[PDB]
Amino acid sequence: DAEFDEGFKVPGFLFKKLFKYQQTGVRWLWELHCQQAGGILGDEMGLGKTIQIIAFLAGLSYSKIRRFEGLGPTVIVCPTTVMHQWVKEFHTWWPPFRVAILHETGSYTHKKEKLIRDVAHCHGILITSYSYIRLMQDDISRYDWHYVILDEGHKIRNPNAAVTLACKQFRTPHRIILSGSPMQNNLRELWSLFDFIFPGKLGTLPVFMEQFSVPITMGGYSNASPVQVKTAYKCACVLRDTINPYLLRRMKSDVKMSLSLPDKNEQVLFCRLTDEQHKVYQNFVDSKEVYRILNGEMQIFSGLIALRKICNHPDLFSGEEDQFGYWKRSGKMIVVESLLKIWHKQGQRVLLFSQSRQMLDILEVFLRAQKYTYLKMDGTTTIASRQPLITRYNEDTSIFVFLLTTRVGGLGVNLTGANRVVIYDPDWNPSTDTQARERAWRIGQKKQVTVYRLLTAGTIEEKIYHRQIFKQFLTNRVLKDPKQRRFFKSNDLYELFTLTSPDASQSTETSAIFAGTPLASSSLLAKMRARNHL
Amino acid sequence: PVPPLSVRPAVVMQGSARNQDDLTHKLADIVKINNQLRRNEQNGAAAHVIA
Amino acid sequence: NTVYVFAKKDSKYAYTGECRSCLENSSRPTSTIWVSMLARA
DNA sequence: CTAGTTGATCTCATATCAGGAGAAGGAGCAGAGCGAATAC
RNA sequence: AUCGAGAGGA
DNA sequence: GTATTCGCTCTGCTCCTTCTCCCATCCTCTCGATATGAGATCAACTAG
């Protein structure tokens, strides 16, 4: 059996099964357990983070380290769609853990409070949903939990949500987060996650923002004064080394040689607005509503929703060959016509993504107007019948296009039989579109998958994509390397109520922006003066 | 104590714009600052900021 | 710009003179100076 | 019993001078009155 | 309709 | 052993300061200013 420095006898017949990065992760988790601190397994999806957690907890139970003779009661807060998976994983790796699910489905068939009491009384392994943490936040937190594992802990990304407060009401030193991305939009989410795992390490959120978030974003613009970008680099370095020993994040660059990965290509099509759609958009951006938005007298949010609706299709905003949702009145639907026809002639299989469920229904009606066989899964479908549809799409070839919104289903529902994917409209979060493209291109994908993002040039959608890239750049700067070539302008990125459609004489805004493509008190002093000159 | 709607009627106007009463606006102010203060006292907030 | 001396019966001054001085070209509002007399070494 | 459909409801997320009068408190001084404290 | 303002009447 | 003071306290007395309140009734007219959907939960079905 493998043995660590202080003595943590992870069993040989489990430890041998792990991969090198998995064993490194178990080492890191147990270093945290010795320091009595929490962490974030920020390894991206597909590497396997549940295996690391069960291996580490099993070693902690067999090693009988101690308070508690070995491992005590632990709570795992995960989305419903994976709860049963978790128990099966335990039951196949380490059987003697009395694992139990808290759910209406469940297995207890009695009062749930009795389940919490009984499981804690046996030092069991208890799995919940985030909603049960929120609802029983006073009840579930009375039985001296030894570990808290927030699987997909990006549910805590908001420092305001009641789930965040209910999850931060736990008392143990041991807080582990299993999230594919600690931050998705901005540094609010990084702060919230670190306030969970380690209450004191990063400062109070005001302090954190005023020190890190504002300088970094101010240095994320290409029109920033040199002092601003240098301060942003320095502050990013400080945040990086502050979070270094508590965020274990591994990419698919170092671990790529261990597992295969088919090549992925991606294009961003810029779909010109149709003349009627262009007229409607120009009338809205000239109407008094956007003027009141610019005055601040009305919520800008409704104007955003309206312009997104216009760029999707005029029939959304406005409300034979003239029925609801005719595909000839929006240029993005023209390109979807061309791509769907060509891909059907190629015999491939398509994922059709869109943030709007109404335009998802419009796309359904369009597909019915054509003769493409298809299958739909969205939020309106019952969850108990979600797994069949996916399976029926993945097993046969007699279904051509599968319809999604970016945010339906559990994280990473296995849509492997698809070959091509089209994202009909961009979202504000880079992570939801990254998840959309990732869902088709996962482990065990047989053929080269390509993603086509559909944009309308010079419109709100182009600015949504620009914001998405900007947030992605911020996340990358924080998480992998601070030095980064600056792409954007502060005023152009934030002003998003104009219409400059290209005439093909001049290039599009995105291509114009992307036009180029003990210490001995002297090392200590050298590092201090180095950081200070920046 | 929030009073009922009859103490602070929302009178309708020549069109559809429903004008609220001064008490309703003031309760809006109290509610917003109460919620905001609540999230500060719940979280870590400077003693002078809480004050 | 005129000195006016009044006497308030109920006050801590027997006599108080004031001038609301104001530069002729209206560069500024009138600024008032008071020269008082403390009430009744 | 027992799963599938239908509505309501909640959360969450998407950007960019020409008053006056009276009552309540606090302030500073003034003294009265009694305990101790030298002292003849 | 509400609010305020102003001008008036006895 | 009693003078005699004497320090210290206990009101208490004016006074100045603050502050809060009030300022006829009723009536007429004019005039200006003043979001949307996806997902989850639950509960009623709505039938098998």
Swiss-Prot record, chain A:
First and last residue shown, out of the full length, are 490 to 1399 of 1493
This protein's name: DNA excision repair protein ERCC-6
**Result of mutating residue 49 to R?**
Abolished ATPase activity without abolishing ability to promote transcription-coupled nucleotide excision repair (TC-NER)
Motif CSA-interacting motif (CIM): where? 521-533
Residues binding ATP are: 43-50
Q: Describe the disease involvement stated in the record for this chain.
A: Cockayne syndrome B: A rare disorder characterized by cutaneous sensitivity to sunlight, abnormal and slow growth, cachectic dwarfism, progeroid appearance, progressive pigmentary retinopathy and sensorineural deafness. There is delayed neural development and severe progressive neurologic degeneration resulting in intellectual disability.
Q: Residue limits of the Helicase ATP-binding domain?
A: 30-200
Q: Which domain of life is it from?
A: Eukaryota
| Entry note about domains | The CSA-interacting motif (CIM) mediates interaction and recruitment of ERCC8/CSA. A C-terminal ubiquitin-binding domain (UBD) is essential for transcription-coupled nucleotide excision repair activity, interaction with RNA polymerase II, association with chromatin after UV irradiation and for mediating the UV-induced translocation of ERRC8 to the nuclear matrix.
Please state which protein family the record places this protein in: Belongs to the SNF2/RAD54 helicase family.
Relate the assembly described in the record: Homodimer. Binds DNA. Interacts with ERCC8. Interacts with RNA polymerase II; interaction is enhanced by UV irradiation. Component of the B-WICH complex, at least composed of SMARCA5/SNF2H, BAZ1B/WSTF, SF3B1, DEK, MYO1C, ERCC6, MYBBP1A and DDX21. Interacts with KIAA1530/UVSSA. Interacts with ELOA and CUL5; the interaction is induced by DNA damaging agents or by inhibitors of RNA polymerase II elongation. Interacts (via WHD region) with RIF1. Interacts with SMARCC2/BAF170, SMARCB1/BAF47 and the neuron-specific chromatin remodeling complex (nBAF complex).
Its PTM note reads: Phosphorylation at these two sites promotes the intramolecular interaction of the N-terminal domain with the helicase ATP-binding domain, thereby probably releasing the inhibitory effect of the N-terminal domain on its ATPase activity. Phosphorylation is essential for its chromatin remodeling activity.
Q: Where is this motif: DEAH box?
A: 151-154
Query: Where does the record say this protein resides?
Result: Nucleus; Chromosome
Residue ranges of domain Helicase C-terminal in the record: 335-494
Explain the purpose of this protein. Answer: Essential factor involved in transcription-coupled nucleotide excision repair (TC-NER), a process during which RNA polymerase II-blocking lesions are rapidly removed from the transcribed strand of active genes. Plays a central role in the initiation of the TC-NER process: specifically recognizes and binds RNA polymerase II stalled at a lesion, and mediates recruitment of ERCC8/CSA, initiating DNA damage excision by TFIIH recruitment.
